[PDB]
Design a protein around this ligand. Structure first.
Ligand code: HEC
Ligand code: HEC
Ligand SMILES: *NNc1ccc([N+](=O)[O-])cc1
Ligand code: NI
Lengths: 77, 339, 493
């Protein structure tokens, strides 16, 4: 575990339960909305259940429109 | 649009933008598509006993909708936030009565005030399907925390998946532990872990879920299968393999109940009796949810992206793919039925 | 405006006035400057608060000064503000499982609240993210009862609103006028090398300043820049210095004429340097660069510090063959260690100034990769997030004359990547994960699904980072995982 990663491995986000990356979504996009819809990894992946409900508006098809997913923190400027 | 045909087999799946699609199982092609009201999330659907109306948990886990598949008409709608000052969410927890006259849903509410939140105890809310688009609780009972999947048995009883699987009387609200999970004090083993959000309406007529459990970091990881026969109420569990990889969903073939197919990064075919992997298949990408047709002659892989993978269960090889209009299926559960 | 009127004009309505510029929730918590920015940011994102970046900066400053943390209350968890995301946290299990499985446990430790405020926080979590109690390390227990009955009282005990430290800090807190002046600095950027020079801090409006960095790296690449900085709570230094073509953020703790912290790229927090500075007016010996000398070797060594006066003595066996330059903040000389010099540390000195050690060594026995474990991340390729590099250094170890282990330092090495396991070989991670450069910098692959890979998967990988010393060919091993991006990235991890 690293300070910048999640410890909730279901199978996880930035490392799986086994400590590798194989049990993760392949590709990650296959398990993106499965992570986002019910906010399974809210600290890394933005919740659409409550906080960022229109996050994937321009990316309904994550396999092809993953580039349209923006960052969520309200940075200066 | 086109009304569904009698005797014909169909499959419903929900797609990202906010679609409900009907797939003609015989030709493996999209029969028709319906646009659902409001917003998507989770999009989990189940067919009513009429083989005509689909009930969907949508609008960010806070509303249930009834949609007539022959016309795409929104015939029912129950908001889960009927209590003043609270926002209610359903963690995939909803079921339809055997006669289709009531819908149940456990609501985990949160009172949202001006400068703070207060999490409130959960509650089962009963809705009458006759109430249409403004359905309100006709009955409510207290529910324990961490409740998710629920399925109404033939005798009207409701099997509730929570820390333990409960059997609940929907008239009195009293419930008993039907199958202990957390409090399954089985020696030599740990408590089982269950992560399941796919309420399969399988041909076998059972409420089934997969679980993992350690058999005594020394512990031997195993995969198990749990099942509640919805006809008789008979409960059953059994480990079928040593955990080598993960699977999200798993179904027993209606063709051969001794074979269980699990899926996530690979589609695996197991021998329950022998507790042995008979065959595995590599996928084009991660798939969440399995679905068998009535005869068990086909196996569909759904969830994740916008395509269904059609597999031949015997050879365990992808026959074709059904590309759905729109985007990701996400955590949707492919539902098969005969119109 | 002024902090108090903005508090009322922007927070009131939702937050109840309790008298003399105090409000519900707000006046009962103490956080770091980034902690305050995060709370206000949540108000905008979650509650629709309408506030300009300027008024937000005004409120953060006001709240950071009024309700901040004493220096000792940040002890051991400063890595979070310093954006050290590869830090392996060490907290008790209850805190880690309950509160540190999503974000860092440090985000919790950088706050002080009474039990009721810790309780409101627990209700907010389960209320904003209902799935919380159905997740790993939550579904296996009665999460809410445990959190309210066990965790809240512990959090209130470990991190209380009132403390002796906070009390004394409000009285002993210095003003910003104690910072202007010349500051000699020493530092080190992983996979790049040492850096040294002088930072000129001149005053500006209020608690803000103008900053001038004059210096260079050990290799000769310049480190000159200009920027500004603000000082929160009398010690929390936050600055931005445009050095070359990159904006570097400075997160230092300025205490007793000394600044300790980290300076990283605004956009890439894995690309940074450790930073230590000493204010002029006090004689200090900051660092020796390099901090090692091989027996029977010729080497240009430079001493960094403040008020350096006298003659440099590098210990027994080390010969100062010529002082190439001797200013009060930098003394670069040529040295020669005898082939006979006994291996071990040497107390270095400039006149009567002592403080830093120089390791004389004969041979390298053991090599350690630093960091031993880290996370690299795919990015760019059209994505909204940047790549997160793997940056490494080979730490050499030997033995001194007393048979005791000797940490020599960071020695030049050759870098390569190998599959970490049978799985990584099968999927060809070394071919897709990215490229390990000769300088120890690993550049991950681009983001998105990769049609070329099995299951069109991402350019992720499970790698073994191998360093082989140029001095003797002794190898070392590290572990690096190249993973997916994260779109939610607040000021604190
Ligand atoms: C133990 C019960 C926990 C404590 C104590 C805290 N958390 Fe969390 N947390 C989570 C998110 C998604 C956020 C903020 C949104 C974002 O990061 O983008 C937070 C935030 C906090 C904060 C900041 C509070 C503020 O600014 O007012 C504190 C002090 C905090 N958390 C304490 C997510 C999660 C989560 C995953 C589902 C868990 C288990 C926890 N947090 C647990 C704790
Ligand atoms: C109404 C729409 C709000 C305005 C305007 C502001 N806040 Fe708020 N705040 C609001 C709620 C409903 C809550 C409770 C739930 C939550 O998000 O935490 C809060 C809470 C806070 C807190 C406590 C945070 C914690 O983790 O305990 C703080 C410190 C806070 N609010 C600060 C704050 C400030 C400084 C505001 C002025 C710019 C402000 N809030 C406005 C709702 C609303
Ligand atoms: N960690 N991701 C994840 C996606 C989907 C489900 N699920 O559908 O139950 C669970 C976890
Ligand atoms: Ni070694």
């Amino acid at each position: 575990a690293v300070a910048g990663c999640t410890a909730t491995t279901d199978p996880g986000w930035e490392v799986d339960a086994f400590g590798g990356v194989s049990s993760l979504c392949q590709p990650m996009e296959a398990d993106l909305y499965g992570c986002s819809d019910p906010c399974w990894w809210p600290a890394q992946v933005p919740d659409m259940m409550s906080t960022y409900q229109d996050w994937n508006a321009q990316a309904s098809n994550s396999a092809e429109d993953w580039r349209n997913l923006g960052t969520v923190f309200p940075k200066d400027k | 649009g086109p009304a569904l045909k009698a005797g014909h087999e169909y499959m419903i799946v929900t797609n990202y933008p906010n679609n409900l699609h009907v797939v003609d199982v015989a030709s493996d092609t999209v029969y028709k598509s319906c646009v659902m009201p409001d917003k998507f999330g989770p999009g989990t659907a189940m067919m009513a006993p009429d083989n005509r109306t689909a009930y969907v948990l949508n609008n960010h886990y806070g509303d249930i909708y009834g949609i007539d598949l022959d016309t795409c008409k929104n015939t029912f709608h129950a908001n889960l936030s009927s209590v003043p000052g609270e926002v209610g969410r359903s963690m995939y927890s909803f079921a339809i009565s055997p006669d289709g006259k009531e819908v149940y849903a456990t609501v985990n509410p949160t009172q949202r005030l001006n400068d703070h939140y207060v999490v409130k105890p959960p509650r089962l809310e009963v809705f009458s399907t006759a109430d249409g688009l403004e359905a309100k609780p006709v009955r409510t009972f207290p529910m324990p925390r961490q409740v998710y999947l629920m399925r109404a048995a033939d005798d009207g009883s409701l099997y509730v998946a929570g820390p333990d699987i409960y059997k609940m009387d929907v008239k009195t609200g009293k419930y008993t532990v039907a199958l202990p999970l957390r409090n399954w004090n089985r020696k030599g083993y740990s408590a089982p872990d269950v992560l399941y959000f796919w309420p399969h309406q399988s041909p076998r007529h059972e409420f089934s879920m997969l679980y993992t459990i350690a058999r005594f970091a020394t512990a031997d990881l195993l995969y198990g299968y749990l099942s509640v026969d919805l006809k008789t109420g008979k409960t059953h569990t059994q480990e079928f393999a040593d955990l080598t990889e993960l699977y999200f969903t798993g179904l027993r073939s209606p063709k051969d109940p001794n074979q269980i197919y699990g899926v996530l990064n690979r589609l695996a075919k197991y021998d329950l009796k022998q507790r042995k992997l008979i065959k595995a298949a590599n996928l084009d990408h991660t798939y969440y949810c399995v679905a068998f047709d009535k005869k068990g002659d086909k196996l569909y892989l759904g969830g994740t992206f916008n395509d269904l993978a059609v597999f031949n269960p015997d050879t365990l090889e992808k026959v074709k793919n059904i590309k759905l209009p729109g985007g990701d299926m996400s955590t949707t559960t492919p539902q098969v039925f005969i119109r | 405006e002024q902090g108090p009127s903005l508090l009322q004009n922007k927070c009131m309505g939702c937050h109840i006035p309790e008298g003399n510029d105090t409000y519900s929730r707000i006046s009962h918590q103490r956080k770091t400057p980034e902690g305050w920015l995060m709370s206000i940011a949540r108000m905008q994102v979650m509650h629709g608060l309408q506030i300009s970046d300027d008024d937000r900066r005004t409120l953060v400053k006001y709240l950071a000064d009024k309700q901040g943390l004493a220096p000792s209350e940040t002890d051991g968890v400063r890595y979070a503000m310093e954006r050290r995301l590869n830090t392996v946290e060490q907290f008790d299990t209850q805190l880690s499982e309950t509160c540190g499985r999503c974000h860092s446990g440090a985000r919790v430790a950088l706050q002080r609240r009474p039990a009721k405020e810790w309780e409101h926080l627990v209700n907010f979590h389960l209320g904003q993210w209902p799935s919380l109690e159905y997740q790993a390390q939550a579904r296996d227990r009665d999460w809410l009862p445990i959190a309210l009955q066990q965790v809240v009282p512990d959090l209130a005990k470990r991190y209380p609103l009132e403390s002796a430290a906070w009390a004394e800090w409000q009285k002993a807190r210095p003003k910003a006028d104690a910072l202007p002046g010349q500051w000699a600095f020493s530092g080190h950027m992983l996979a790049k090398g040492d850096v040294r020079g002088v930072m000129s801090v001149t005053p500006d409006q209020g608690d803000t300043f103008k900053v001038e960095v004059k210096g260079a790296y050990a290799d000769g690449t310049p480190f000159n820049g200009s920027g500004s900085a603000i000082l929160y709570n009398g010690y929390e230094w936050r600055g931005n210095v445009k050095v070359g073509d990159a904006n570097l953020r400075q997160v230092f703790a300025a205490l007793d004429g000394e600044m300790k912290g980290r300076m990283f790229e605004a956009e890439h927090d894995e690309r940074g340097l450790d930073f230590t500075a000493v204010k002029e007016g006090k004689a200090r010996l900051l660092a020796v660069q390099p901090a090692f000398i091989k027996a029977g070797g010729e080497s240009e060594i430079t001493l960094v510090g403040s008020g350096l006066a006298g003659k440099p003595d590098l210990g027994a066996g080390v010969e100062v063959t010529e002082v190439l330059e001797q200013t009060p903040t930098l003394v670069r000389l040529k040295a020669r260690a005898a082939a006979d010099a006994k291996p071990g540390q040497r107390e270095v000195a400039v006149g009567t100034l002592k403080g830093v050690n120089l390791a004389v060594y004969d041979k390298v026995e053991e090599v350690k990769v630093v960091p031993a474990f880290s996370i690299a991340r795919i990015g760019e390729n059209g994505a909204s997030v940047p790549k997160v590099q793997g940056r490494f250094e080979a730490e050499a170890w030997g033995k001194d004359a007393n048979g005791q282990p000797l940490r020599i330092g960071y020695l030049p090495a050759s870098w390569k990547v190998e599959p970490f396991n049978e799985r990584a070989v099968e999927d060809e991670d070394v071919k897709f994960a990215g490229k390990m450069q000769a300088d120890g910098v690993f550049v991950p692959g681009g983001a998105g699904p990769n049609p070329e890979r099995k299951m069109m998967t991402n350019n992720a990988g499970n790698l073994k980072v191998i360093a082989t010393l140029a001095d003797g060919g002794q190898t070392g091993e590290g572990h690096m995982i190249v993973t997916v991006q994260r779109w939610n990235n607040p000021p604190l991890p």
